[PDB]
Design a protein around this ligand. Structure first.
Ligand code: SF4
Ligand code: SF4
Ligand code: FES
Lengths: 38, 84, 208, 688, 114, 71, 123
């Protein structure tokens, strides 16, 4: 287990080229303004 | 307006400035025994040319100097501005 | 101690004490220090005056040949108050030995070319003018080798931040390949490896 | 004349009769490896990793505790010593389980920078390794006791300096643990400072717990301002953010010690923070506007008001370089009536000559002092390092103590003299004793706080206590000069914010209704909008949002204490300049550069741009704020001893009480504390 | 300071020198401006030369004023010949690089803490 | 704002997650005091580390290993 | 020989660019990381400059930067020869001071005492 069944390739656009991204949680957590009341 | 404040700078040594140190002995307790409003300022050391400073008229600085004086020379040098 | 520790040899260390004893004997106008590297090599600390002179004595003699010039180089040390350093390095073909000649300097003080003594310091002196900035006078030619035509910084000295000051990139807005200030895609992380406790007692700096 | 010569490694060196081997062999530049020995603590013998080998005697001694007699030959490096230091540090690697990937000290530990350089090569054991079990103490100290080389450097410290006696040694033989027999959690100030002590990774810090190893960081020295004594700290930066902070081992203030609050409080620095300018809008609407926009909003409104109708008050941790740019600007429109948030009662002094205004005998004075009387304060939770700078000196030589009012829990044996303001007076002559004891004292000392001085009768106790200092000093009064009467503050930047000449106490606004205020104070509950007249606007300036963020007109951001090169002052009147670390987030800018770009867009344009043209101005208005860390000789309280006797005001009657009692209020006080979410974890582990 | 100077002695032969190679530059800007087939107003080429020689003005010393020369004496080797291909030259006049504010309030809206 | 980069690119992300995949393990027991945690097979796995389970009911899985472990 | 004595305070100009007058260097003795007791990381007076902004790079989060010095630490051997290299290259600077402990007086065997107040238990 924990390994595949068939296979894949190295393809140029498959459409899926995987085009990596960032894997992390946010950073500074900006402030929320207060709601409707004065 | 003025005036506003008076800052007597001095030095701890180079006794050539000692008049100021002596001026406190002479007129401070007495000089400021009146004027219970003005907040004259003794700050520490310019080490050289113990320039007296004063500030008034929207924060314009006027700096007299002193280098080597006697005791009463400065006592009369202060009312130069203080009368005005 | 024997199995893993490099076995020493004494004979090589007796002679290079002698033969170097007396080149502080016969040219005292110049040589200001000499010593023996524990591995059986010599270092002759020489004033900047003799450079053409001393080699010329080392150039020919029947007691010291030193015809083969191998490696000229430099080192640049701040907090030596005279920055740079030279190190000449010469092999004497008959007597099988290496004797290196250290001569200090600054940027402003010139040093005089060795080129008529050996013709193989022709390049090694063109280079150093590029890198560190030392200026060798009376040199048949002085030019720019190892570096591009733009570097005005003289890199290998210790003030050049590793990435130089101008990255390069080509743009099609006209037809050239032009130069815009350096903008990286990663910080070049600075790690910090220097561990405490002073593991070397023998080199222990003066007590102070 | 009283010294010995002893040859270390065949080199002569002089040593006072009664220094040990280790303090000699340091003088010539060697470290005998160390485990249980440490300077500031006491000494015991149970590491056995320093074995020096004496010359001509078959035994091998230990260089921690044993004197040095007429000259031995102290032989560090031979084939005898190297037979021991290799043979101990293969013992204490017998049980030391296979951490170091993940032991959070894994980059500094001393089972690591010994046992490569000194000592062994590989191991022969081959099977074994007890593993005991951990427990918990508090939400700081994290405890894996599987390790414990058992120097017993955490234990001799509790019974020592921070006087809380809890930790113990429970057991016999191969098995003894350390942590406490019962379940008692161990919590106090300075006792978050252990985790410098323990040489291996037994005790490691909670909030930091897993974030970064220590070869990656960047040590940029700094100074901590939440409070009087300051510090000397050192920050750290990974990616351009703060990770954790240490002490810097200054030799007077912070011996090696940093307090607890100044350590775990970096954590509310990146939490809730105002990153922009925010415009006014008329409603409860408050919105973000481009930097240029809400600058002029308040620019013109200065061209309206004039005279005392516009007054600014800055009471907080603000620097000593935004206490000029703001003073000269608001004083070049000739409107002053400005003070700080604090309250310093004044009669005939309090600015001039200062003499009573700062702590006179420095921290390093206490070490010599003999008789002490301190009143109206709980020195423990304000300036926590002036406390234990008594404690260590209360021990190690004799010292006497007395407090006035509300007996609290301190760490050492004092005695409550009396509780009321009305006790001070009768001590002028003989009554309610000491009577001669302050009188017979060779170096008396008296310490008044900022909590008691802040009463409504305040100008009396200042003048009532000064008398007893005059009472003694006029006799001799010490030897000698040896100044006596002195004060201690609890607030971060005041002695700067004051002896620049900014009048003490918030009154000058309390008499009239000035329309336009600038709040740098700012979070004290002193001035409200109800107390103000009609909606004429106050402009908040500062980094946080705590209280006074909503009640305000137009706000402007700023940089905290780690982002700006500033100048603070501690209560001996030194000058310590914090240094840049992270560059401030979003759009916020430095404070004294937000003044001059308020000036030029308005009428007057102040006479400087760069920093050095700020401090020359700091140099005119004061001489000693550019003298970094030197205590200049001044007494000058004779002439103010009499002149402050001018007014005759007498006391109130009511027992003195400090604001802080036992703990829970120590944490959330200033600004950053309040928003620090870990304090929010150790405040609820107090109540229950 | 005692060290041998390079070429000059004090300030005069030195400031005869900087006057000198000026003309080698001033006489030859343009032969290149047709040679590389680079197009500019030939007077630009005579503004830059005079823009640079006025730059380092505060120099108080020989062996500095000789040092700068040894650089300046070189360039006329490369440029009066062709060792550069159009793109080692034109880099003097920076075409692409967006302007710097250099004023105050133009900074304060773009960029942190210069 | 940031989110326009993977438009049409299908955004590789991790189908399984180990955030907790651990708790499904039949947390073991021994009947003894201290144990040897060398995991995943001899000489492939974390360095040997011995942990004490004496609490009441807990264990301790050494933190390299993760695999829920107790008596 | 052309010895030609004179005095002109050594300075050098043109090699860096605007970073001559903009910055302020600093000369300081490193403080000993306190998590460990090793005293050998002291003893050399280095220098290191001011820190300017590191921002975030909006693709990954590497913190990319300008300020091309930012990472240099030279190591000098002493103060007399410390300032030697700021003037000679001509930029502004500042100085800190070295620190070493009190003498001090510590004696085991004073820990068991008749009338003294220093008497330890469970050491
Ligand atoms: S804790 Fe100290 S000893 Fe145990 S592993 Fe980490 S470093 Fe090695
Ligand atoms: S913490 Fe680790 S080292 Fe410090 S005492 Fe307890 S066990 Fe020994
Ligand atoms: S270091 Fe030797 S006794 Fe602790």
């Amino acid at each position: 287990k924990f390994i595949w069944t068939n296979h894949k390739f190295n393809l140029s656009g498959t459409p899926q080229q995987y085009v990596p991204y960032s894997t992390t949680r946010k950073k500074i957590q900006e402030w929320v303004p207060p709601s409707t009341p004065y | 307006l003025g005036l506003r404040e008076i800052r007597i700078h001095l030095c701890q040594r180079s006794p050539g400035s000692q008049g100021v140190r002596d001026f406190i002995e002479k007129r401070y307790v007495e000089l400021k025994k009146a004027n219970p409003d003005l907040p004259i300022l003794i700050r520490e050391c310019s080490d050289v040319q113990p320039k007296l400073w004063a500030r008034y008229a929207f924060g314009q600085e006027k700096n007299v100097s002193l280098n080597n004086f006697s005791a009463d020379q400065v006592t009369r040098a202060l009312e130069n501005v203080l009368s005005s | 101690t024997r199995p893993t520790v490099r076995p020493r040899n004494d004979v090589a260390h007796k002679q290079l004490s002698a033969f170097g004893e007396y080149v502080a004997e016969i040219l005292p106008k110049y040589v200001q220090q000499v010593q023996v590297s524990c591995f059986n090599e010599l270092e002759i600390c020489i004033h900047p005056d003799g450079v053409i002179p001393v080699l010329t004595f080392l150039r020919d003699h029947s007691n010291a040949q030193f015809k083969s010039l191998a490696d000229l180089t430099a080192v640049d040390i701040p907090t030596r108050q005279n920055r740079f350093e030279i190190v000449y390095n010469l092999l004497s073909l008959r007597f099988n030995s290496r004797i290196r000649v250290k001569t200090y300097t600054d940027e402003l003080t010139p040093i005089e070319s060795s080129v008529p003594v050996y013709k193989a310091a022709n390049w090694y002196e063109r280079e150093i003018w590029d890198m560190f900035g030392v200026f060798f006078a009376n040199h048949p030619d002085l030019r720019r080798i190892l570096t591009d035509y733009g570097f005005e910084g003289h890199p290998f000295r210790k003030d050049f931040p590793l990435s130089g000051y101008v990255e390069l990139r080509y743009d099609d807005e006209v037809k050239r390949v032009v130069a815009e200030p350096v903008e990286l895609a990663q910080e070049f992380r600075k790690f910090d490896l220097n561990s405490p406790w002073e593991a070397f007692p023998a080199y222990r700096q003066p007590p102070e | 004349s009283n010294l010995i010569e002893v040859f270390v490694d065949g080199q002569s060196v002089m040593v006072e009769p009664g220094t040990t081997v280790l303090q000699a062999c340091e003088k010539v530049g060697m470290q005998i490896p160390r485990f249980c020995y440490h300077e500031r603590l006491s000494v015991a013998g149970n590491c056995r990793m320093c074995l020096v080998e004496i010359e001509k005697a078959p035994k091998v001694v230990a260089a921690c505790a044993m004197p040095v007699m007429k000259g031995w030959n102290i032989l560090t490096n031979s084939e005898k010593t190297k037979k021991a230091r290799e043979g101990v540090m293969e013992f204490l690697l017998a049980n030391h389980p296979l951490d170091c990937p993940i032991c959070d000290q894994g980059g500094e530990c001393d089972l690591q920078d010994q046992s490569m350089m000194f000592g062994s090569d590989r191991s022969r054991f081959l099977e074994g390794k007890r593993a005991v079990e951990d427990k918990n103490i508090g939400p700081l100290v994290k405890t894996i006791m599987t390790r414990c080389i058992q120097c017993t450097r955490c234990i001799r410290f509790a019974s020592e300096i921070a006087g809380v006696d809890d930790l113990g040694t429970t057991g016999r033989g191969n098995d003894m643990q350390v942590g406490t027999y019962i379940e008692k959690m161990f919590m106090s100030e300075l006792s978050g400072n252990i985790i410098d002590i323990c040489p291996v990774g037994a005790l490691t810090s909670k909030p930091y717990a897993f974030t970064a190893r220590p070869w990656e960081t960047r040590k940029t020295e700094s100074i901590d301002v939440m409070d009087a004594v300051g510090s000397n700290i050192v920050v750290s930066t990974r990616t351009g953010e703060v990770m954790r902070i240490l002490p810097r081992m200054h030799e007077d203030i912070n011996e090696e010690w940093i307090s607890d609050k100044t350590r775990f409080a970096y954590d509310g620095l990146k939490r809730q923070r105002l990153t922009e300018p925010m415009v006014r809008n008329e409603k409860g609407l408050l919105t973000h506007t481009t930097w240029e926009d809400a600058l002029s909003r308040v620019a013109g409104m200065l061209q309206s008001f004039q005279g005392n109708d516009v007054a600014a008050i800055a009471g907080g941790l603000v620097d000593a370089e935004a206490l000029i740019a703001l003073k000269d600007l608001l004083n070049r429109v000739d409107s002053d009536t400005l003070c700080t948030e604090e309250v310093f009662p004044t009669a005939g002094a309090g600015t001039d000559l200062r003499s009573n205004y700062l702590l006179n005998t420095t921290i390093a004075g206490v070490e010599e002092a003999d008789v002490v009387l301190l009143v109206g304060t709980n020195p423990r939770f304000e300036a926590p390092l002036f406390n234990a700078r008594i404690r260590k000196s209360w021990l190690h030589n004799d010292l006497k103590v007395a407090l006035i009012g509300s007996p609290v829990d301190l760490t050492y044996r004092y005695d409550h003299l009396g509780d009321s303001p009305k006790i001070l007076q009768d001590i002028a002559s003989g009554s309610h004793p000491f009577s001669q004891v302050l009188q017979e004292a060779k170096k008396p000392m008296v310490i008044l706080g900022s909590s008691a001085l802040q009463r409504n009768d305040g100008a009396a106790i200042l003048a009532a206590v000064s008398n007893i200092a005059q009472k003694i000093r006029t006799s001799s009064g010490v030897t000698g000069d040896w100044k006596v009467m002195n004060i201690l503050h609890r607030i971060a930047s005041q002695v700067a914010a004051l002896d620049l000449g900014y009048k003490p106490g918030v009154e000058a606004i309390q008499k009239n209704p000035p329309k336009m205020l600038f709040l740098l104070g700012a979070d004290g509950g002193c001035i409200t909008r109800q107390d103000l007249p009609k909606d004429c606007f106050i402009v908040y300036q500062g980094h946080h949002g705590d209280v006074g963020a909503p009640i305000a007109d137009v706000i402007l951001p700023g940089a905290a204490y780690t982002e700006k090169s500033a100048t603070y002052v501690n209560t001996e009147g030194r000058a310590q300049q914090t240094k840049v670390a992270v560059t401030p987030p979003g759009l916020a800018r430095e404070d004294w550069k937000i003044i001059r770009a308020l000036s030029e867009i308005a009428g007057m344009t102040l006479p400087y741009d760069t920093l050095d043209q700020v401090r020359n101005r700091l140099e005119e208005v004061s001489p000693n704020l550019v003298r970094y860390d030197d205590v200049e000789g001044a007494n000058y309280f004779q002439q103010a001893s009499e002149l402050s006797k001018l007014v005759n005001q007498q006391l109130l009657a009511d027992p003195l009480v400090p604001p802080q009692l036992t703990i829970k209020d120590f944490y959330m006080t200033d600004s950053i504390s309040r928003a620090s979410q870990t304090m929010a974890k150790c405040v609820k582990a107090v109540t229950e | 300071t005692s060290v041998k100077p390079i070429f000059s002695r004090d300030m005069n032969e030195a400031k005869r020198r900087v006057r000198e190679l000026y003309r080698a530059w001033y006489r030859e800007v343009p032969n290149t401006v047709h040679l590389f087939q680079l197009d500019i107003s030939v007077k630009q080429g005579r503004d830059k030369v005079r823009e640079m020689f006025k730059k380092n003005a505060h120099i108080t010393d020989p062996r500095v004023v000789d040092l700068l020369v040894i650089k300046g004496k070189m360039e006329l080797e490369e440029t009066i010949k062709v060792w550069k291909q159009r793109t080692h030259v034109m880099r003097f006049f920076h075409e692409t690089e967006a302007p710097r504010p250099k004023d105050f309030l133009s900074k304060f809206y773009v960029g942190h803490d210069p | 704002y940031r989110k326009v980069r993977f438009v049409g690119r299908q955004k590789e992300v991790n189908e399984n997650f180990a955030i907790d995949l651990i708790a499904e393990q039949p947390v073991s027991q021994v009947g003894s005091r201290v144990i040897s945690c060398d995991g995943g097979g001899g000489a492939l796995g974390h360095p040997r580390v011995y942990i004490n389970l004496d609490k009441e009911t807990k264990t301790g899985t050494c933190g390299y290993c993760g695999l829920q472990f107790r008596q | 020989i052309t010895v030609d004595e004179k005095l002109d305070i050594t300075t050098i100009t043109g090699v860096p660019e605007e970073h001559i007058k903009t910055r302020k260097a600093r000369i300081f003795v490193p403080a000993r990381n306190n998590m460990q007791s090793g005293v050998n990381n002291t003893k050399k007076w280095k220098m290191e400059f001011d820190t300017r902004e590191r921002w975030e790079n909006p693709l990954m989060g590497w913190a990319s930067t300008a300020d091309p010095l930012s990472n240099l630490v030279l190591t000098f051997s002493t103060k007399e020869d410390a300032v030697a290299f700021a003037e000679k290259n001509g930029w502004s600077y500042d100085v800190e001071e070295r620190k070493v402990p009190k003498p001090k007086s510590k004696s085991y065997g004073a820990n068991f005492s008749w009338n003294k107040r220093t008497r330890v238990s469970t050491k």
